[PDB]
Structure 1
Amino acid sequence: SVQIVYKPVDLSKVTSKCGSLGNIHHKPGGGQVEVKSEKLDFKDRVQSKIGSLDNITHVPGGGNKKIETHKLTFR
């Protein structure tokens, strides 16, 4: 005579919250710029930014993962 009962429960939260979240930015200022760079030789790629304001978020991460591997047996 045997009885077996298997009823596991998952109620968990796995969560990520990444970047610029929930800020208040009120009346931000800015400013003025020049470039006169001259005769220049670049052997490879040039990357440049000449903003007044930069307001930025960059999120390579935050990739949650869950794994769940259940088993039972008799004989």
Structure 2
Amino acid sequence: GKVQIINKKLDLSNVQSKCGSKDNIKHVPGGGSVQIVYKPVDLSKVTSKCGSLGNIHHKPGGGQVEVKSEKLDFKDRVQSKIGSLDNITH
């Protein structure tokens, strides 16, 4: 007589990335050959709640069989180069 199962959840989770920089360049009075190269590669990435979540099952009977499988797989790559930069004065 009787069976029971329950659940409850809450999230208020914060998952920011790179969300508040203040980059800037200023004030060059000059007289000679100034040069700048600034922050030449930048990235951000966020991933959440992937895969199998929240499912419910009900399967009565003594003779049965069951099989399952799962996978998750993530990859990234980056490359960069800077050249023959030149300046002279007089």
Task: Work out whether the TM-score is over 0.5.
Answer: no
Which TM-score applies when normalising by structure 1?
0.45
Which TM-score applies when normalising by structure 2?
0.39
**Structure with more strand by fraction:** 1
